[PDB]
Amino acid sequence: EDTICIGYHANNSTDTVDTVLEKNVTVTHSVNLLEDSHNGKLCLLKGIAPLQLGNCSVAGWILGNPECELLISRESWSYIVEKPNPENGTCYPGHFADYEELREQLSS
Amino acid sequence: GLFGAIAGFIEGGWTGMVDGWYGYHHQNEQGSGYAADQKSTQNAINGITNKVNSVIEKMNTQFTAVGKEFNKLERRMENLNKKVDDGFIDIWTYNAELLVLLENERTLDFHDSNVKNLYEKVKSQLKNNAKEIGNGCFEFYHKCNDECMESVKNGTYDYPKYSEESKLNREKI
Amino acid sequence: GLFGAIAGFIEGGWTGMVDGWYGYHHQNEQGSGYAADQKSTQNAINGITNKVNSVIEKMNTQFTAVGKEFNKLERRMENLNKKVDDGFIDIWTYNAELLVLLENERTLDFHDSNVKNLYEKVKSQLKNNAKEIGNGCFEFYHKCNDECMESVKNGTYDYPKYSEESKLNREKI
């Protein structure tokens, strides 16, 4: 004879969370809050380009090291790009006090 | 089945239907079929919309610059700024992780709640006219067509429609 | 109506009564009227008292001085102290905002729970002696005076009082 039943959804899915009372807990649908990924690029903000040094230090950039392109046309930019170990420090060495402070002032 | 259904009196889910997260399964002489409850389903999903908007939006992400650097005569400030940043990092980490755990629990309870509510709504029409069976389902001492199905979906039955047929077909049991 | 009542089997609230957040509405030959359930209402409101004391008090507000200032050779410390303070500000902001959302939800569920509990208490006395009707209400197969009302309020009925009158007035139905 006739019957009525409740119903709800399942699917083929096997995506999982952690939860208070059980782990790897499977659900139908999920959403990742996280961005665990990076494109592996140096893109630019907004249409505003960044500054690039290539091999140079900030000393070689600001002072006018001839092997560093001065690039006066670079009037403003999005962010500064270095490497960790900048090749071209000062050709005639010398202490450069408050490197920290100058960098922080030239954050932006 | 916090509140008694899902791994409760119900054991498992169904892959037959995909149009909505909730519904009914109708069974009568014309055939069987699954059919989704877009009313309560859409209301709940609107709740999830307001949730996730009310999680994402509650940040304010500044036009930020993180990093700093120091010489080796600034080690006060180095171990500070490390302690500072690691403190903040850990606090966002801890609070957000707990928030994912708790919010997903409350989401499970929200769903469980909604189906339990609907289960009582199904019960409330058909109390003596049709019986609890097994789990998940009710059997009718009378018969029901697709009009009777869609009527019972939207919260309508006409209680005296088959009150007498249940009054007779009960009485062999 | 998380748990099935408020926008559940009940549709809406009532402005007739103001003395307490919960109650009953009595209907008999002497008349109609609303009357509040100060027992469970007062217990719940004591719960809200302990809540709000347990939200406000959990701060410790120091005899504080916020502000600082710097020259332009301290920009490490300026952008630091900005980052520091904005970090703290945002964390209190985020945690407190989530706390208002969650606590108000749990308050709604607390209320919904209490009325559902009381609904089963009303049911537990009058199970076969009087019937579920419609929503929100029970009909008696017998009669009930104001003494019967106030008795049924405080958790007392005398089950065999009108067991037979319901046993007869049922049987036409």
Next chain:
Amino acid sequence: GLFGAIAGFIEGGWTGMVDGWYGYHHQNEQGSGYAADQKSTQNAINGITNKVNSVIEKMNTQFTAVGKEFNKLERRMENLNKKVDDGFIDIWTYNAELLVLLENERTLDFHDSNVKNLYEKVKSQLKNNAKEIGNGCFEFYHKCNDECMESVKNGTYDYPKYSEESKLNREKI
């Protein structure tokens, strides 16, 4: 008794049994006795295990060195580092205190939920065959031995076993 039982329809707890947090009390001609529900009890306690692991582990405790010190020409950094540390201290304090309150509430609700679920499981077998009584208990219109007890524990009854004995012993009432 958030959900209706504990200080709800049930008034209080029992010291007779210690083997598990939940169970039944059986009463028949052979005697009385208490007996624990290790299935749901063990599942719940596994939940508490995953909880407390998911509270403790979520910290990361560095190989840390807290303290600092300063002269009196560093008072910027002194009142800073005081403000810094007191800020962090208060935030961990506030969040953790709220977390103890909330988690213990959700634990109470978890327990209350589980017993309510089990109460409906006890109901689901013995619906018309045996009646609600008082609070906390069901009376049988038929008889039940220790095999019937242990069967009813693990989710088994054989509904037509004593369907007729209840069908007759009801009918004097």
Next chain:
Amino acid sequence: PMDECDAKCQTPQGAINSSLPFQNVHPVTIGECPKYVRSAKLRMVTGLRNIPS
């Protein structure tokens, strides 16, 4: 490497989608950014449990 592509937040390991609130990826950032954690993953449920039989 450096590229003409566009973004709203940036870090040395790469340019970043500013859609979502959080990364676990690297703390240093510039722009309109996520926030860092030390974690493996964070995934809210939309749907619910999946059991066929």
